[PDB]
Design a protein around this motif. Structure first.
Motif, mmCIF file in Angstrom:
data_model
loop_
_atom_site.group_PDB
_atom_site.id
_atom_site.type_symbol
_atom_site.label_atom_id
_atom_site.label_comp_id
_atom_site.label_asym_id
_atom_site.label_seq_id
_atom_site.Cartn_x
_atom_site.Cartn_y
_atom_site.Cartn_z
ATOM 1 N N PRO A 22 32.981 -16.210 -50.097
ATOM 2 C CA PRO A 22 32.165 -15.499 -51.097
ATOM 3 C C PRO A 22 31.022 -16.341 -51.696
ATOM 4 N N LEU A 23 31.278 -17.620 -51.980
ATOM 5 C CA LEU A 23 30.226 -18.474 -52.536
ATOM 6 C C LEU A 23 29.167 -18.731 -51.474
ATOM 7 N N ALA A 24 29.599 -18.885 -50.226
ATOM 8 C CA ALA A 24 28.664 -19.137 -49.156
ATOM 9 C C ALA A 24 27.782 -17.893 -48.970
ATOM 10 N N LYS A 25 28.441 -16.740 -48.890
ATOM 11 C CA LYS A 25 27.803 -15.440 -48.704
ATOM 12 C C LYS A 25 26.759 -15.161 -49.783
ATOM 13 N N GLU A 26 27.128 -15.377 -51.045
ATOM 14 C CA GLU A 26 26.221 -15.166 -52.183
ATOM 15 C C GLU A 26 24.980 -16.069 -52.056
ATOM 16 N N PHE A 27 25.220 -17.346 -51.778
ATOM 17 C CA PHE A 27 24.131 -18.281 -51.570
ATOM 18 C C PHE A 27 23.199 -17.882 -50.403
ATOM 19 N N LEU A 28 23.782 -17.529 -49.250
ATOM 20 C CA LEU A 28 22.995 -17.216 -48.065
ATOM 21 C C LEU A 28 22.258 -15.894 -48.244
ATOM 22 N N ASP A 29 22.866 -14.922 -48.925
ATOM 23 C CA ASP A 29 22.113 -13.734 -49.327
ATOM 24 C C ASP A 29 20.878 -14.079 -50.200
ATOM 25 N N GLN A 30 21.026 -14.974 -51.183
ATOM 26 C CA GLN A 30 19.884 -15.417 -52.008
ATOM 27 C C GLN A 30 18.828 -16.083 -51.131
ATOM 28 N N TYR A 31 19.270 -17.009 -50.282
ATOM 29 C CA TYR A 31 18.359 -17.729 -49.410
ATOM 30 C C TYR A 31 17.614 -16.735 -48.496
ATOM 31 N N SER A 62 18.406 -9.272 -41.831
ATOM 32 C CA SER A 62 17.915 -9.490 -40.478
ATOM 33 C C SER A 62 19.070 -9.962 -39.569
ATOM 34 N N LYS A 63 18.821 -9.941 -38.264
ATOM 35 C CA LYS A 63 19.721 -10.564 -37.306
ATOM 36 C C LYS A 63 19.947 -12.057 -37.592
ATOM 37 N N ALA A 64 18.899 -12.808 -37.931
ATOM 38 C CA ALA A 64 19.086 -14.219 -38.253
ATOM 39 C C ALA A 64 20.022 -14.391 -39.459
ATOM 40 N N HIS A 65 19.864 -13.532 -40.461
ATOM 41 C CA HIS A 65 20.735 -13.518 -41.629
ATOM 42 C C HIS A 65 22.194 -13.259 -41.226
#
Ligand code: HEM
Ligand code: HEM
Ligand code: 3XF
Ligand code: 3XF
Ligand code: H4B
Ligand code: H4B
Ligand code: ZN
Lengths: 407, 411
Positions: free
Chosen positions: B49-58, B67-70
């Motif tokens: 969840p912390l990773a997901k939240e961060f990568l969504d922000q990024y 996107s596919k890259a996301h």
């Protein structure tokens, strides 16, 4: 549940339990701190009365005595029958002192138990209010040897018969908008001044015109009165080294006296309760004189000191600020009008906190207001952790009456 | 929900929506405000969840959300977590994360600069000697002969909490403090305990008033090791006053580079326990706090003596008077030697512009009023009159315990 506050200069750690008695809400949540925001029935009344009488009877070492039980019974009967109740004189005095004691934004609370309470609950008219207020002003002023006082007008009933002092302080200066575009006098008071003119006041249109009182009795339309000029002690401002300072034509009044707050004791609401003490120097020299939106005098003073106003980094603002505040204190001391400097007041407040912690288990304090507006970290309060919470009896803000009053 | 803040000087009202993205807790409740309190090994379950939240922000920040890259990156991180119990940030994500921890630092008045931050990736570092080399390069790069540049160096992230990288110094450059048998202190009383640790570890203390402390560096959970920063890399400024010629004879100096080294950087639930960062000084940090705090160099009396101020009562404001002069001296000295510094008027004015821009573009700017308002002349700066909302966004810089309290000594 038990909370520690640390002073980072002295390493003194105090333990707070008093907060567990806090009733009202702060504005903050676990997600958001609102510490720097300026303004964050018969059923309701009995718990409030009970809570207050409980602390009162505890305070006089008579908790659980027959006299305690008897009063609780008496007040209960009075509410059930009349929908409200009347404080005994002893309870009123206690509640007033405690509202000050609990004022988390007041640095001067070491004085809390020395407060003269004037019971004006028998007042019925605006002329009555004016008489009471002049007596308060004269008593508090005491020819420059100032004494803390509060005058308490009748309590809220059905809320359509409120007593109010329309002024924000008993004594303040008028502010006028000029054809010029700028402002003559105190910009904070422009709207109130217009209301005075609108209700009939004849403004002298000067820089330092003491405003008239606008007094509202029993929910009636408010009336105007000029405080006898001889009761309004004022101080011309001069500098001990700079002979030109007086040429600025600065003066201030000796009596700080907040008139627009609401005193809540045991669930009863006292909407007109003007109270007064004595100034801390910075209130006048830093805020009244130097706030951009007040008398805003830093530019003029700096020019007279011939400082380099080219770059902010010459600290010309900071230099002039200190001199203005030296002058305020000097002028008050020289005319023998009680004043305290910010070093002395903050030092006293730390001693007061320590007394409150040992004798009461804590002291609610709002660091944002307690730390003086100049030289923060060279005063001991800067390094003192403070817990802020709301205890009752209390002084509260209330809407300006002109937004509320129906003519 | 929307929250409004008002500036009581200008009547400008701002509206905050960003606080809705805050997760971490403040210390405050509906019943108590802890706004003036100084200080108010993860599972896979809590990590994704912390990773997901961060990568969504990024991915939103680069306009590639969904996107596919996301999606592939989420899949790749998810897989990495389940298989190795942690994950590695891409260089791009580390850079973004470090910039955002600064952007989110509500106690920092200097945040107008947040997007110009040089990030040094030191995640390939393995030893204390390696750390020393990284830190020397950061110091040299950041110092840039007086034309200071913001930088952060990021050492490998926490794994099991038994192999932490830690810089033991609270700041990369600081002066030693020595307690004398007579109870007086020579040098900086704030650094006495740390100085004692250095001496115990084998540092040869010169025992002066401004001895630059050695670095004490811990790699991979090992016992820390001492290193002297090369003196030619430590830019210092002797303090003098433009009008008072006796000011130089107080013998004061300070270093040019403020570089905090004891905080923890959290990005996407990963913990970088060694992440020294540096900027440039605001003058009051030295002239007010370092020089004039009673528990620091405490120079107020000696300065007021030499100015011949009336010192018999506090109400002459002698302390306030000496304070302004010392602070003039600090700005004058830095400017004269061409070492970057900012006065508290300029810095706060810039902060208000930054804050308003942040409200417009980002929906808010968390800010801690207690810290933002300078320790002298508070109400003649515009921040005093600005209402602020304090809340905690991630990525973030956090406090962490001092390593001497927690370290398992190996011998
Ligand atoms: C005896 C000398 C006193 C001193 C030196 C003093 C000091 C101060 C100062 C410096 C402030 C901040 C005001 C501002 O920045 O606008 C303040 C606020 C306040 N004080 Fe006092 N005080 C004194 C007496 C009193 C008394 C007698 C009372 C009530 C009985 C009182 C109740 C309050 C309250 C409720 C506030 C907050 C006002 C607001 O929120 O606008 N103080 N005090
Ligand atoms: C570029 C010039 C900068 C200036 C003028 C500046 C200014 C300041 C000041 C005056 C403080 C308060 C320090 C104190 O009273 O102890 C502070 C705190 C802080 N700043 Fe900055 N800053 C700058 C750059 C940076 C950078 C590059 C970072 C990190 C990337 C940063 C992150 C922080 C953090 C995390 C705090 C809180 C420290 C604590 O809680 O002890 N700042 N800043
Ligand atoms: C009793 C006493 C003693 C003392 N030394 N000092 C005082 C505060 C007085 C005097 N000097 C400032 C004034 O305080 C007046 C209350 N201030 C509140 C406010 F004006 F900031 C308003 C502005 C608009 C809406 C939000 N709040 C009281
Ligand atoms: C990057 C950057 C730029 C700048 N201008 N300024 C800074 C803060 C540095 C410099 N000048 C003070 C120091 O700040 C260090 C953090 N100070 C807090 C503390 F040391 F007091 C402790 C007390 C206990 C609780 C935790 N914090 C950083
Ligand atoms: C926004 C902020 O809360 C506001 O400027 C406060 C700060 N501290 C203050 N402190 C005092 N004593 N009086 C004030 O009016 C204020 N104003
Ligand atoms: C108790 C109080 O919160 C503490 O002294 C804070 C106040 N404001 C501060 N503000 C800054 N910028 N730095 C500090 O160290 C502090 N100390
Ligand atoms: Zn809070």
């Amino acid at each position: 549940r038990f909370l520690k506050v640390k002073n980072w200069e002295t390493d003194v750690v105090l333990t707070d339990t008093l907060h567990l008695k806090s009733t009202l809400e702060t504005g903050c949540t676990e997600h958001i701190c609102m510490g720097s925001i300026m303004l964050p029935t018969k059923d309701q009344l009995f718990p409030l009365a009970k809570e207050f009488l409980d602390q009162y009877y505890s305070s006089i070492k008579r908790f659980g005595s027959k006299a305690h039980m008897d009063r609780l019974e008496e007040v209960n009967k009075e509410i059930e029958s009349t929908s409200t109740y009347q404080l005994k004189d002893t309870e009123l005095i206690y509640g007033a002192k405690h509202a000050w004691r609990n004022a988390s934004r007041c640095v001067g609370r070491i004085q809390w138990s020395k407060l003269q309470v004037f019971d004006a609950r028998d007042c019925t008219t605006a002329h009555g209010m004016f008489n009471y207020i002049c007596n308060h002003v004269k008593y508090a002023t005491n020819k420059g040897n100032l004494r803390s006082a509060i005058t308490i007008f009748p309590q809220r009933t059905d809320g359509k018969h409120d007593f109010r002092v329309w002024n924000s302080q008993l004594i303040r200066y008028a502010g006028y908008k000029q054809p010029d575009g700028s402002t003559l006098g105190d910009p904070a008071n422009v709207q109130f001044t217009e209301i005075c003119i609108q209700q009939g006041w004849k403004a002298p249109r000067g820089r330092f015109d003491v405003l008239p009182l606008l007094l509202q009795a029993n929910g009636n339309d408010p009336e105007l009165f000029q405080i006898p000029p001889e009761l309004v002690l004022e101080v011309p401002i001069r500098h001990p080294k700079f002979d030109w300072f007086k040429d600025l034509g600065l003066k201030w009044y000796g009596l700080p006296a907040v008139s627009n707050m609401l005193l809540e004791i045991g669930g009863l609401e006292f909407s007109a309760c003007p109270f007064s003490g004595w100034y801390m120097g910075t209130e006048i020299g830093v805020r009244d004189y130097c706030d951009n939106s007040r008398y805003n005098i830093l530019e003029e003073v700096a020019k007279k000191m011939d400082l380099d106003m080219r770059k902010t980094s010459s600290l010309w603002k900071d230099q002039a600020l200190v001199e203005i505040n030296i002058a305020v204190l000097y002028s008050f001391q020289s005319d023998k009008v009680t004043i305290v400097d910010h070093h002395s007041a903050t030092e006293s407040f730390i001693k007061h906190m320590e007394n409150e912690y040992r004798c009461r288990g804590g002291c609610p304090a709002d660091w944002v207001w307690i730390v003086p507006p100049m030289s923060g970290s060279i005063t001991p309060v800067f390094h003192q952790e403070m817990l802020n919470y709301r205890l009752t009896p209390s002084f509260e803000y209330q809407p300006d009456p002109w937004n509320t009053h129906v003519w």
